[PDB]
Ligand binder design. Structure first.
Ligand SMILES: [Ag+]
Ligand SMILES: [Ag+]
Ligand SMILES: [Ag+]
Ligand SMILES: [Ag+]
Ligand SMILES: [Ag+]
Ligand SMILES: [Ag+]
Length: 135
């Protein structure tokens, strides 16, 4: 079971990976649906990293401890982007749901709701797009 401290420690690099993937999409994605999704992921998840970073220092009096090829060389970026981003998002929703029943902090509770709602929604849309484009 996650604590607020451990959650931020794992979710931050996790969110940062989604952001980096999304950055590639801005250059490498062919579907405009994906570029839109990418800008959303970048905006929402960078905001959440900033919030988590800020809260971590207030609560724990120290900064957040600092702890490819299929996507890089790819000729079919849009396809492999979704293949990666779906289970990635599912992992975030899973971690957020876990913390949500353990946490006592109202700001963590609300952040979990955002992660769960926004990323579940992007999962639905990506599955539908995968079906339309590659089904
Ligand atoms: Ag994440
Ligand atoms: Ag990745
Ligand atoms: Ag790339
Ligand atoms: Ag993700
Ligand atoms: Ag995890
Ligand atoms: Ag298409």
């Amino acid at each position: 079971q996650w604590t607020d401290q451990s959650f931020i420690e794992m979710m931050t690099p996790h969110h940062q990976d989604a952001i980096d993937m999304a950055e590639m999409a801005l250059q490498k994605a062919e579907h405009p649906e994906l570029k839109k999704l990418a800008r959303n992921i970048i905006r929402d998840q960078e905001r959440e990293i900033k919030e988590m970073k800020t809260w971590y220092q207030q609560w724990f009096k120290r900064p957040v401890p600092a702890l490819l090829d299929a996507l890089a060389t790819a000729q079919n970026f849009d396809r492999e982007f979704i293949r990666q981003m779906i289970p990635h998002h599912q992992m975030a929703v899973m971690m957020a749901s876990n913390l949500k029943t353990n946490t006592e902090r109202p700001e963590m509770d609300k952040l979990m709701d955002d992660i769960i709602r926004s990323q579940s929604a992007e999962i639905k849309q990506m599955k539908q797009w995968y079906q339309n484009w590659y089904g």
